[PDB]
Amino acid sequence: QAVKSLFVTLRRGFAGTPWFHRRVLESLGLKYRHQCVEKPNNSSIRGMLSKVPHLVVIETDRMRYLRELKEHYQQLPREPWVLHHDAQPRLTPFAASQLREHVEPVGLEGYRANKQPPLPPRKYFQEQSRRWRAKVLTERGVFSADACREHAEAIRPKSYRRRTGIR
């Protein structure tokens, strides 16, 4: 029944605690709440613990062995219960969208089937093409092959999609 060691757990914090109790808690080796350290049983450790009895939870090694045995036997598996006791409501448009994305098999064909028109050019590429056209009309002229071909490609209609997101 000899107390070989002690198990010390913080139940309080460090904020608001005076600095000398804080230093005693530092020298006990406690840094965080719910943290348990194993300390020896000599008069040094007992002096440190009697300075701060309202901040910690002290327990004997035998006490902790009995508690860990008790909860270890409690967490052991037991037999299952067998209880005998013997039309989905509605789904929203968003729920239909989410199941259409993930659950029913809809995107299972190739790429040549189910391919879409491209999205319209993003604003960076539009600015790059605008800069190229300004360069062409400056140093090559209005009547060039590049300017006329760029105008001819601009006049023809293009098959695009609609942006859905914000990017």
Binding site: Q75, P77, R78, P80, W81, L83, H85, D86
Partner: peptide, 13 residues
Amino acid sequence: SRAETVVGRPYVP
């Protein structure tokens, strides 16, 4: 199932 439920203490074997 619709008829019975095997409620498992920790886990069902």
